[PDB]
Design a protein around this ligand. Structure first.
Ligand code: 5GP
Length: 132
């Protein structure tokens, strides 16, 4: 979990389960589906949450990525496509990534997270499990 309240994603996360696998999408893909969001607004980034486990006397928590619309979240000020560790930029081919998405943040208990879903044809990154 988080010990500093996070910016809340509209969407469920995507969790790595196989080490060694890269988090990626084909250009033009990787924006999760939300009812009524026009394709011109489908732009943003996946943000990596590095997780850390406590030591036991048993025997390791892999990252989980969350989506933020362009101009929101923890990297709200960074330019689209800029090489930044833990940030993976995604956008519909219909989006102009020079402008922030006209999309209001989520929460409080106005709205639960939308289960992450992608349109038919989307190449899913192997080794990752989409929450929900
Ligand atoms: N605790 C926590 N919840 C978040 C965060 N980002 C937004 N959320 C919500 O937590 C859920 C993440 O999906 P889940 O990984 O639990 O399947 C999403 O519904 C997401 O919007 C976060 O950074 N920390």
């Amino acid at each position: 979990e988080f010990n500093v309240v996070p910016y809340y994603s509209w969407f469920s996360g995507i969790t790595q389960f196989q080490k060694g696998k890269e988090f990626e999408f084909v250009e033009g893909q990787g924006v999760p589906i939300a009812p009524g969001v026009p394709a011109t607004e489908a732009k943003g980034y996946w943000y990596r949450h590095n997780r850390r486990s406590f030591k036991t006397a048993d025997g390791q928590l892999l990252p989980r990525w969350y989506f933020y619309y362009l101009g929101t979240g923890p990297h709200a000020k960074d330019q689209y496509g800029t090489d930044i560790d833990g940030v993976y930029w995604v956008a519909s081919n219909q989006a102009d990534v020079n402008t922030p998405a006209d999309i209001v943040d989520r929460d409080p208990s106005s709205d639960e997270a939308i289960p992450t879903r992608f349109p038919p044809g989307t190449v899913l990154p192997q080794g990752y499990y989409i929450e929900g």
